[PDB]
Amino acid sequence: RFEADEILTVRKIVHPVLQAEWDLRYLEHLKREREEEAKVMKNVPGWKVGESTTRHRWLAPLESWDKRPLV
């Protein structure tokens, strides 16, 4: 129990740093994707680059690095 409590405390310390690093990387990837979309759809009439789909709540990507199939 003492070992588990120490590891939980360290994970609580490290978790905001990792979430911040994820956030900055996600923003850079979005910027690259918007540049690519602006290069593809420049001549399409009425298209808007960067149109968020939802209205209030941010939508995380469905897939993630940490969930992989076992076999």
């Binding site: 969930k67 199939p69 076992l70």
Partner: protein
């Protein structure tokens, strides 16, 4: 991802193969292959414990009961009109229409879904089973009690 998709698609082939063959023994062998392959398919989704439950219950316990019943009750009658009567074309048409072309699919209007692996937590399952769904757990126990008493009452004397 050729082998994973092939392993997924093999389950439907084994499902057809269970009923296609004339040998009851071979039907059970196809079912055992299907349940092992499906337990490996469920582990592509991230489920380690529930795939093992699938294996342990269906292959370990229930198929032994199937093989005992078949081996005790089946004198060979595959020639005795199991081959000489064939099958039903109306049933095959129903299977083709509903399971190959799939005119009434489960996804309904949607046709594409993104498969996502999970991360099974058995602490979450233990918390759910013994705190949030505890009444369902007890009623499952009551169903198992019905099975035990009812079998021992229905055992042929």
């Amino acid at each position: 991802m050729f082998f994973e998709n092939s392993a997924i698609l093999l389950c439907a082939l084994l499902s057809i193969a269970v009923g296609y063959t004339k040998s009851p023994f071979m039907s059970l062998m196809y079912s055992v292959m299907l349940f092992i392959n499906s337990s490996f398919v469920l582990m592509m989704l991230g489920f380690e414990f529930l795939a093992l439950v699938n294996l342990l219950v269906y292959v370990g316990a229930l198929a032994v009961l199937f093989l005992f019943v078949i081996m005790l009750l089946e004198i060979p009658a595959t020639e005795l009109r199991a081959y000489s009567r064939g099958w039903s074309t109306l049933g095959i048409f129903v299977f083709i229409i509903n399971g190959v072309f799939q005119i009434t699919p489960s996804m309904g209007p949607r046709g594409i879904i993104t498969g996502l692996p999970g991360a099974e937590s058995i602490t979450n399952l233990g918390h759910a089973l013994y705190l949030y769904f505890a009444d369902l757990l007890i009623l499952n126990s009551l169903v198992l009690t019905v099975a035990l008493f009812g079998r021992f009452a229905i055992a042929p004397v």
